[PDB]
Structures are given as C-alpha cells and as structure tokens.
Amino acid sequence: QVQLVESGGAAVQTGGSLRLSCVASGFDLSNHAMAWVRQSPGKGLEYISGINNGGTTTTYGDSVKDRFTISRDNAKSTVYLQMNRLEADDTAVYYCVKSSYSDIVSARFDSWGKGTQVTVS
C-alpha cells in the first residue's frame, strides 16, 4: 500500500542546519510531484517547498526561500529537504505529501505522511 515515512526531526540551536528525509513505498515515485507542508503548534498549514517528478522545477514558500532546498532521488525512492540558518520560527511538524500529478502546479495532495518534529532553541 501507499506509504510515506519521514525522518530527521531533532532539536537544534538557532542558526544551525538540519536535513529531513521522506521514503516512499507502494507506488512509482518517478511519476509524481512531491512537496513539504509544515504546521506550528496551534496554528495552520503552510506551504514550504515543492518539486516536479523530473526535478527540473522547484518552488518555495516566502518564509524559507534562499534558506531551504528540496531534492529527490527517484531510484532510491526518497525526497529530501535541506534546512539552513534555522530560526525559532521554524519550530513545527513537517509533513511529506504526494501529488496525483507529475508536475507541481496545484494544491491537490492525495497522500500525507505522519510527520517529523523540529525544535529550534
């Protein structure tokens, strides 16, 4: 069955870096665009970054551009998120999502992971 598993969340210091992973199972990752969605405690959903199936187009949320970078390895069935120059406002749970389409052009997210927590102190 279709499953998304995230890993890498930890408690780090302000200004540090961290790298998150999302392993996909039960489908062909090379046919789907992917993205990251985060949620701070008691607040709403926020779009972080997205990438198309070929990795040739990337977009970012306004709060994380020039700081975060998204990548993927279709043969290893894995999506990554590199986070640099962290600040306290990055403390949230980060979800790995999969789109039905092969391109990052919509807000349709059919599958969600369980999420990983990041703490900035």
Next chain:
Amino acid sequence: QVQLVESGGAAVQTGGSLRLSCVASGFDLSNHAMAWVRQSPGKGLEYISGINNGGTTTTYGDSVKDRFTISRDNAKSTVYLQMNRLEADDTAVYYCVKSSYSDIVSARFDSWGKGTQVTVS
C-alpha cells in the same frame, strides 16, 4: 461484530433525573455481566454500577448508592441506568462495558462503548 451503543446523555438541572440506555449487538447478552464506567473531564476512571447476567446481583460505587439503579432486558438486548437526584459532581462521560464472565466479580472489561455525555447545571 461486537458493538455497544449508548444513548440518553443530556444537559439537565441539579436535582433532576435522567435515564441512559445501552444497546448490545453481535453477541448473546444473556451470557455476560455488564457495568457502567464514568470519567469526569481531566480525571480518572470511576466504577458506577454492575449487574450479573441474570439480574439477581447488583453493586454500586460509593458515590452513587441509593441514587442510581441498574437494570437490563436480555430479550431486548439493552442495559439501563436510572439516575436520580443529580448533582454537579455527576457531570462526566458514561461508558457501557461488557465482562467476559457471566457474574460481576472482577475488573475484567473486554468491550467498551463510545460513551454518552451528561451535564448537570
């Protein structure tokens, strides 16, 4: 499949009365002892009343004796709880539970309902 469904919870006034129902499905009710368990918001579990499969033995929690009464109708597959002279300390969620044994002699409760809420104002 085995299922327990409760009904009757409502918001009433201090000193009033209320009658709760629990309908059982998926098994033979006449082979099992039954009981009621309640939980006040943010607090623990509390034993309210129990009855054996033949209805010949009944026990009560110390806080509700002389006020509450338990009964059953095996042909209608239903258990009842009559609550009289209600007080604010009776505000809680009330669970209908089923024992594996035919007698009310243990704290083994194999199946639980979803519960009904009672508010005393």
Next chain:
Amino acid sequence: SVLTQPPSTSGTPGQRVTISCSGSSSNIETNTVNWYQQLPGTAPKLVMHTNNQRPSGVPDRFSGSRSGTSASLAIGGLQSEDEADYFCAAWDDNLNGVIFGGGTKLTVLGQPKAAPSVTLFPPSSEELQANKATLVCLISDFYPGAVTVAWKADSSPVKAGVETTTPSKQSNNKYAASSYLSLTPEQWKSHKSYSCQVTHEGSTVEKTVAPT
C-alpha cells in the same frame, strides 16, 4: 498570505452547515480549490479536489463549489464524527506556490452556547523583583471551545511575545484557556495601558490594565 475562512462554526445534529473561503484574482479565480480535514493529533486528509470532486471513501453529504473568487464546502446531515478543522487551498500565481486558508473549526452542538468570562491580571510584585513582567488574560466558561485573542500596547497591535493555550474542557463541561504576554519591566512602564480582546463566534469583549 492566506485565504479568508471563518475561525469557527457549528450546528446541531442532522443540520446542514457550510464553510466559506474567499480569495483573489491571483488564486481562486484562475486555479481550482481543494479541501482538507484534520482531526486532533493526526495528519490532514483530502476530502475534495478540483473544486467539486470527492475522493473514494468520503460520504455523499460532502459537496463543494466555486463562484468568482470564493468557494464553499457544504456538509449535510451533521454527524458527531464530522467535528474537525477544515482548510481550503489553491495555487497562487503571485506567490508561485500553494496558499492555504486559516482553518475553520466545526463543532457539533450538544449543550447551550455560552459567552466567555474574561479577567486580566497586571504583573505580580514577586516577578517584578526578578526583572519580569508577564500579563495573564484568563478566559473561562465558554462553548463552543474556540477563541481568538489580540493584544494592544496603548492602541497599537502587539504580536511578539504572545502565547495562548488550546481550550480545555473543565468540570462543568465548558471550556477554558489562558493567554500570557511576556514583557520587560521597562516596556510595561513605558506605555499608558495594555489591552486583551477576545473573539468568540464573531462577538468581542475587551479589557484593559495600567501600571499602578
């Protein structure tokens, strides 16, 4: 930054409720809308895509629409299991990405509604001696359990240093919460007054305190 949704709505069992979401020429007018449902402590789930199409495993009482720059999600025959937080979402050409709504918390009523009691507390003398000035705005005895809070220094909005707790059910089955603002003793004496305003289903109450 976000699409506009009402912060909270409610209805009685069997009733039909609708949730609004309003956008701009940059998003909803030119891009389709998606709806997501989230229960406490779990991931959000898609319940509607491409304006008005339902995923498999979503009851027929759910329905979506789009008109101009706004959308709506209709739920008929309210059941207890529909109590959740609902978000709208669409692509946005100005942001080059996805824009979300603020979220609407839906409650299935089971007791009479009640307006909150609000009490505001100035700093205590023991914490002022440890070079601290924290204010508390106590909010109690309200239903349904969703509120929004805003602080002001004199008459200007304050956002930094604000924390508000998730509403909690108490012994009378009504909700309570607290909001605290962490200040330094200079900021507190710097201004003429501070204020705490609470919003509950559209209605508002405000309180004010001052250094003595």
Next chain:
Amino acid sequence: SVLTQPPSTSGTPGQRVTISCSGSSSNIETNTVNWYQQLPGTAPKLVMHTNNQRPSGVPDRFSGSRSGTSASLAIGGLQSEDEADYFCAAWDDNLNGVIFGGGTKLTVLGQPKAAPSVTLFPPSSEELQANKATLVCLISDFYPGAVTVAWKADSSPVKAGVETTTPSKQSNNKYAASSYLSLTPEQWKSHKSYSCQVTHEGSTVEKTVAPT
C-alpha cells in the same frame, strides 16, 4: 478510594519502562489485576487481564506481574504509538466493587526535559469591584507535559473551586497550563495567605501571595 500509581513516567525510544500499582489486603492481594490503555479522546482498552495474560492484538513487549499487594506493567522497546494513559484495576471486598488506579501518563521523549516556571497572581481590582476574587497560577515552559497542582489557604488544603487546564504545546514545543481558584472577597481577606504548589515528575515548587 483508589490504587496508587505514579502520575507520570517517560523513557527514550527503544527503552524499557515499568508502571507501578500498589494496593491492600482488600483488593490486589486477593483479586487479580487488569490494565487498560487510553489514548486522547477515545475509550480505554484492555491490554492485560488475569494479572499476566495479553488479549489478542497486543504486542509481546507488554508484560504484567503481581507480587504481594502490588502489580506492575512492563513495556519493552518503547515506540511512539505507546504514548497514552494507563490505569490499573481490581475487585475490592471492602467496596464490593471495582477500584481503579489514578492513571499514569507515559511520554516517549523527543527533546530535553525542563522544569516549569510558576507565577502566581492576586485578584485584580476590576474584578474585586464586581464582587469577585479569582487567583491565577501560571505554569509554563515544561516537558514532559503532565503536572499536578495543590492549593492551600494559610496552611490548610483547599479542594472546592479549583480548575486546572489540560497542558498545551506552545511555539517552542514546550507545554503550558493554568490553574484558577474562584473565591469571594471575604474568603480572600479572611486568610493571611494563599499558596499554589506544582509537582512535575516528583519535584515540587511553591508560591504564595497575600492581600495588600
């Protein structure tokens, strides 16, 4: 009235934790013990019966025992999905019924522990003019998120009129809660002082205020 359990315990993933439950000659010594597991907002579930027998669908890492007047529930290889509240239970001949434990909240650690900051607030002047005297004891920046609170009038315990909110996660991923005591202006001026004591994983902190 109840069996004695620790209010909270924790461990790191992969670790092995144990939960205690101690009774009397009226219950545990002569009657077998049962264990129940409850996740937030759902009904409790049996995970162990007849001292040390596991229902079908309960991992082999769960294990129970009984010795004298006490029992224990052991969990090996802690996983995230084990975070819940655990109750013990047994029949009691003095009560002629079932006696429950107080409940133990188990947390799977994912960040460093932290002791709570406590601040106590006397009544505000606006609420005193409306014939009201409510005290607030603010508790913030603690982990894991479980606390126990006790109030005192001078030196005597007070139980009536106390409400405490369920701990809430805030923007730094630490927890916060509030406890308020509703008094009349006579009761408040009647005594020399009031106190608020907070317990967190066995450790205690206390504060005191007085009418000025």
